[PDB]
Design a protein around this ligand. Structure first.
Ligand SMILES: Cc1cc2c(cc1C)N(C[C@H](O)[C@H](O)[C@H](O)COP(=O)(O)O)C1=NC(=O)NC(=O)[C@@H]1C2
Ligand SMILES: [Cl-]
Ligand SMILES: [Mg+2]
Length: 135
């Protein structure tokens, strides 16, 4: 299960926000979310489970950031982005996402792990300016 991964245990001991998805199920839904993620977003665990995490996006989310995530998942790459997300009540926050594939012995992706850090507007600006300059 989700909490059997050693890196998940490690993340828990530091009270990180994270989610685990299951890409063997159509549309790669969330199958575990940590307490910090639930508090940050305003959803109960049961409500999150079964949703693709794109449910945190909304009209002011930059589709270019979302496309970077999509392509990373498609190309088998680790990906790090900052993008605007939305809580259950519609309020917004900047979310720094760190996503990686969890693989079996043969390279098959068996789950994805995504860590989330709420970041300040100032930090998001500077991150995104750096990303842009570095393109
Ligand atoms: C393990 C994992 C963790 C996250 C996420 C995905 C995975 C697989 N995503 C990214 C979305 O679920 C999704 O991959 C992106 O929106 C790109 O796919 P698209 O919507 O098909 O373009 C998230 N998008 C978000 O906007 N907010 C988040 O908190 C999650 C973290
Ligand atoms: Cl996805
Ligand atoms: Mg559910």
């Amino acid at each position: 299960g989700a909490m059997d991964y050693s890196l998940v245990k490690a993340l828990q001991t530091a009270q990180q926000n994270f989610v685990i998805s299951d890409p063997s199920i159509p549309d790669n839904p969330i199958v575990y979310a940590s307490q910090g993620f639930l508090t940050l977003t305003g959803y109960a665990l049961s409500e999150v489970l079964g949703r693709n995490c794109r449910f945190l996006q909304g009209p002011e989310t930059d589709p270019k950031a979302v496309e970077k995530v999509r392509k990373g998942l498609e190309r088998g790459e680790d990906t790090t982005v900052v993008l605007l997300n939305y809580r259950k009540d519609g309020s917004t926050f900047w979310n720094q996402l760190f996503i990686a594939a969890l693989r079996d012995g043969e390279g098959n992706v068996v789950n994805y792990l995504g860590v989330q850090c709420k970041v300040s507007e100032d930090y998001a600006k500077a991150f995104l300016k750096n990303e842009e300059n570095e393109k």
